[PDB]
Amino acid sequence: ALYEYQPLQIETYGPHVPELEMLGRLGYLNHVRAASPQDLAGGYTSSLACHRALQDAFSGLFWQP
Amino acid sequence: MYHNSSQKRHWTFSSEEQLARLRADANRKFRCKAVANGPNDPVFLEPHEEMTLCKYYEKRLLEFCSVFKPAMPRSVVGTACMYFKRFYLNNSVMEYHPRIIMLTCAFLACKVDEFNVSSPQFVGNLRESPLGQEKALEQILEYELLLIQQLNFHLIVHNPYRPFEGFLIDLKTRYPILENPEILRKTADDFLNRIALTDAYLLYTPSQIALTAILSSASRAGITMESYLSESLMLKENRTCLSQLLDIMKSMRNLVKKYEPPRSEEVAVLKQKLERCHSAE
Amino acid sequence: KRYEKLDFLGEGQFATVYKARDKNTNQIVAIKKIKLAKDGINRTALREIKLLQELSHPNIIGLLDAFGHKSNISLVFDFMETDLEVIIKDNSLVLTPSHIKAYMLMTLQGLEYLHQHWILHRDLKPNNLLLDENGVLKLADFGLAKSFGSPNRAYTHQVVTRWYRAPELLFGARMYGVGVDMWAVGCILAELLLRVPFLPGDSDLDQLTRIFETLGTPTEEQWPDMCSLPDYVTFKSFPGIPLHHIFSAAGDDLLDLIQGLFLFNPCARITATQALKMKYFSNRPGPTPGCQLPRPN
Ligand SMILES: CC(C)c1cnn2c(NCc3ccccc3)cc(NC[C@H]3CCNC[C@@H]3O)nc12
């Protein structure tokens, strides 16, 4: 009865969002404002802002009521 | 997140005729209530007149949030406008005046979007005598729970602005055919504002609205973007989804075209009728 | 207004909680009725309403209903028999490593769902981790929860109960992410292992002193940009106590989880997803089922 992690599948009715650690090496972070040193010291990285914007852009793009 | 939000589950409707039926039902219910309270009286407003007054007071809400000090973030204005739309989707302008509901929607939007404005600041943004500002504050607090009950306690509103920014990031990174997609922004912004005057926010996802605005800006710019939809967004592998998306955007654009602003003389007559109905409420 | 008030469950700054029956289905629920000028409905109530209407996870408290009268509103939640603080403080309960695994697993699953929807709980502590009668932990008390990921919004730094507050908040971070929750999880985990508050500082500087004394004063290699925080004051170079000296009964996998949860760098600090992926949860023993979790009775 051991735990195994499951990636927590939730249907976003839209295109695939690139992963948070993929964002820099795919060039997305070139197009968002760089996090200030205070924000980095707090744990804000501008990968969060970019990822959230990309997730909202794709959340229900393919969905119809 | 929109894809499991209460907005998607409850406040995105299949067609504009369901919205028409809901509004007609609200108008009819107020008429039936008033007749049972003491039938074809010209004092009432017809649903299209209620729609004209709702459009007029939506515009006044935009103005109020435009001149609001301190500067109101765009998400708060969108949240307030969505609240106004939903409230008058299920409620009559003849029962709850759209001026007080306008201000109550702005007030609840400020609270919900964590735009910390004290009530004195909020009512100081009303171009009125201070006694009138206190009266307006009393009415705003009186109607606030009523707004929350009429929203079915669904307070989170997903606006197209964040998906707009996300699509702009995605275009910059993945779609190099379009050099400087920021040239779209302003024009897309304009189209987005127009979409807010229509019933699209109740009919389409905010991402669909944002994509429609961006693609309309691009088409207005002479830029084709079928390649972004099909290859970049991978709709080359699912043509049914591409057809559905193109139909959604086409119908949003048509719904913007057939939008009619409220006429100033028509609005003056309907406002006088509204005051007559609320005087004899 | 279909709710029969059974008992009195508690009182807090913003509200009062009662046990109740939903007569329409005869359910046991908890009614949080909000207490109270010229400001309208309480913002804590509105925060909890707006956030809990958008979330649906087994390990997040369900807002079953909401209603009220003029400027006084009441929220209907799942009724929970106990919170993790009662288990931690019950000297009659033996917290086996499997029980700790179960509690941490449910907490991290709820927090992974919460962080995937860009919400910081931001008030995590053993009180806010409630347990229903079936042994299912749920995150509760969303009165301080806030959406994160938005550059345009500044957040307060006095937002987590001092004993579970991450060092970036004590150093005054205005922008932060999931770290402020995960640190608290570490603290909760530490308390689950010690049955005593891990870092019970009397003040903010005393809290920072406790943290650095227990885990070492962080260097700029551990925590780059640390000096940029608004309330950064340099501390003594504490060596810090090794984690196996603090958690004497912790295996190496549990020590790896604890070390990940307690990294000073909030970016390097593990998220709930990768905490759930660590071998501590995959190893033996398996987490205990909810039906077998210890019940303070
Ligand atoms: C409002 C809702 C989330 C809720 C459901 N059950 N329940 C119980 N149950 C009784 C109890 C007693 C002792 C320890 C925990 C729970 C107590 C309670 N007290 C209010 C706060 C107090 C601090 N911890 C979080 C609680 O929500 N709130 C609730």
Residue C43 belongs to domain with CATH number: 3.30.200.20
Two tokens, residue C140: 């509760």
- Tell me if A30 is assigned to some domain: yes
Alpha-carbon radius of gyration of chain A: 15
d(CA B277, CA B33): 14
Residues C226 and C281 in one domain: yes
C181 CB-near residues (< 8 Å, 6+ apart): C111, C114, C115, C120, C121, C122, C124, C272
What DSSP assignment string belongs to C165-193? --HHHHTT-SS--THHHHHHHHHHHHHHH
Is C13 annotated in a binding site? The answer is yes
Whether C16 is covered by a domain: the verdict is yes
Q: CATH 1.10.472.10: which residues of chain B? A: 2-156+261-280, 160-258
The CATH superfamily label for domain B2-156+261-280 reads Cyclin-like (1.10.472.10)
Alpha-carbon distance of C109 to C136, in angstroms, equals: 11
Q: Which of C51, C78, C105 is the last residue of a domain?
A: C78
Q: Using the 8-state DSSP alphabet, how is residue A31 labeled?
A: G
For residue A26, is it within any domain?
A: yes
Ligand 1 atom showing the smallest separation from residue C85 Cα: 14
Q: Does B144 touch chain C (CB under 8 A)?
A: yes
CATH class of B160-258: mainly alpha
Q: How many CB atoms lie within 10 A of CB B217?
A: 22
Q: Is residue C297 part of a domain?
A: no
Q: How far is the CA of C80 from the centre of ligand 1 (A)?
A: 6
The distance in angstroms from the start CA to the end CA of chain B is 41
The Cα C229–Cα C268 span in angstroms is 17
Q: Are residues C97 and C67 in the same domain?
A: no
Entry resolution (Å): 2.5
3 state SS of A10: coil
With beta carbons under 8 A apart, name residues in chain C contacting B73. Answer: 152
C-alpha span between C164 and C181 (Å, rounded): 9
Taking the C-alpha atoms of residue A11 and residue B3, their distance in angstroms, rounded to an integer, is 7
- DSSP label at residue B75: H
> Taking a C-beta distance cutoff of 8 angstroms, is the pair C214, C247 a contact?
no
Which amino acid is residue B201, in one-letter code?
A: Y
In a domain, A64, yes or no: no
Residues 6+ positions from C6 with CB-CB distance below 8 Å: C18, C19, C20, C21, C28
Tokens standing for residue C284: 């033996």
Domain that holds residue A39: 20-58
C-alpha to C-alpha distances, C220 to C223, C227, C265, nearest whole angstrom: 5, 8, 9
Contact between B172 and A30 using a beta-carbon 8 Å cutoff: yes
Candidates B145, B150, B154, B162: best to mutate against C (most CBs of C within 10 A) is B145
Pair C16, C153 in one domain = no
> Token pair of B260, please?
């009619």
Find out whether C10 is annotated in a ligand binding site.
Answer: yes
- For chain A, the distance separating the N- and C-terminal CA atoms, rounded to the nearest angstrom, is 40
> Pick from A14, A28, A64: which is nearest to B207 by CB?
A14
Q: Which of C128, C198, C190, C192 is nearest to C159 (CA)?
A: C128
B221: helix, strand or coil? coil
Q: With a 6 A CB cut-off, is C9 part of the ligand 1 pocket?
A: yes
Do C33 and C162 belong together in one domain? no
Q: In what order do the strands lie in the sheet with C137-139?
A: C82-83, C129-131, C137-139
* Strands C119-120 and C146-147, bridge-based pairing: antiparallel
Which of C52, C55, A57, C116 lies closest to B205, judged by CA? A57
Q: How many contacts does B have with C, using Cβ atoms within 8 A?
A: 58
Nearest to B13 by CA among A64, C77, C237, C195: A64
**Whose CA is closest to C107, among C258, C259, C276, C274?**
C276
Contact partners of C by the rule of 3+ C-beta pairs under 8 A? A, B
Q: Which residues of A touch B4 (CB under 8 A)?
A: 10
Same domain (yes/no): C63, C177: no
By the 10 Å C-beta count (0-12 exposed, 13-18 middle, 19+ buried), B271 is classed as: middle
Answer whether C184's CB lies under 8 Å from C164's CB.
yes
Looking at B128-263, which runs of residues are DSSP E strands?
none
Structure tokens at B13: 């409707």
Residue C118 region by backbone torsions, left for phi larger than 0, else alpha for psi between -120 and 50, else beta? left
| Integer angstrom CA distances of residue B30 from B23, B90, C123, C181 | 11, 11, 45, 49
Q: Yes or no: say if A14 and B3 are a contact pair by the CB < 8 Å rule.
A: yes
Nearest beta carbon to residue B142 from set C39, C70, C152: C70
Q: Would residue A1 count as lying in a domain?
A: no
Contact check, Cβ <8 Å, C73/B156: no
Run of H or E including C19: strand C15-22
Q: Which of C49, C52, C54 should be substituted to probe chain B, the one whose Cβ sees the most B Cβ atoms within 10 Å?
A: C54
Report the domain count for chain A.
1
Cα separation, C278 vs C258, whole angstroms: 11
Gap between the Cα atoms of B2 and A52, Å rounded: 12
Separation between Cα atoms, residue C113 and residue C118, nearest integer Å: 9
Angle of helix B74-90 relative to helix B130-150, nearest 10 degrees?
70
Please answer whether residues B74 and B161 qualify as being in contact, where contact means their C-beta atoms are separated by less than 8 angstroms: yes
| For ligand 1, atom 16: residue with the closest CA | C82
Nearest to residue C262, comparing CAs of C186, C200, C194, C211? C186
Contact between chains at A1 and C289 (C-beta distance less than 8 A): yes
Same structural domain, C44 and C188: no
Q: Whose CA is nearest to atom 12 of ligand 1?
A: C82
Instruction: Quote the CA–CA distance of C203 and C162 in Å, as a whole number.
Output: 7
Give the active site residue among C78, C83, C123, C181: C123
Q: Within a domain: residue A34?
A: yes
Same structural domain for residues C55 and C150?
no
Q: Which experimental method was this entry solved with?
A: cryo-EM
Q: What number of helices (H) and strands (E) belong to chain C?
A: 10, 10
Structural domain of residue C43, as residue ranges? 3-78
In the beta sheet, which residues pair with residue B205?
Answer: none
**Integer Cα distance of B272 and B216 in angstroms:** 38
Q: How far is the CA of C10 from the centre of ligand 1 (A)?
A: 7
Could you tell me whether strands C3-12 and C15-22 are parallel, antiparallel, or unpaired per DSSP bridges?
antiparallel
Q: Which residues contact C62 (CB under 8 A, 6 or more apart)?
A: C52, C56, C77, C78, C138
Q: Which of A43, A11, A6 is nearest to C105 (CA)?
A: A6
The dihedrals phi and psi of B103, each to the nearest 5 degrees, come to: -65, -35
Number of C-beta neighbours around residue C117 at 10 A: 18
Report if residue A11 sits inside a domain.
no
CB B52 within 8 A of CB B266: yes
Instruction: Give which of C256, C259, C246 is closest to C282, Cα–Cα.
Output: C256
Residue A27 lies in a domain: yes
Assigned domain for A42 exists = yes
Quick check: is C56 in a domain? yes
C78 is catalytic: no
Asked if residue C163 has its Cβ within 6 Å of ligand 1, the reply is no
Q: Please state the domain count of chain C.
A: 2
Check whether the bond before C285 is cis (ω within 30° of 0).
yes
**Token pair listed for B71:** 């500067």
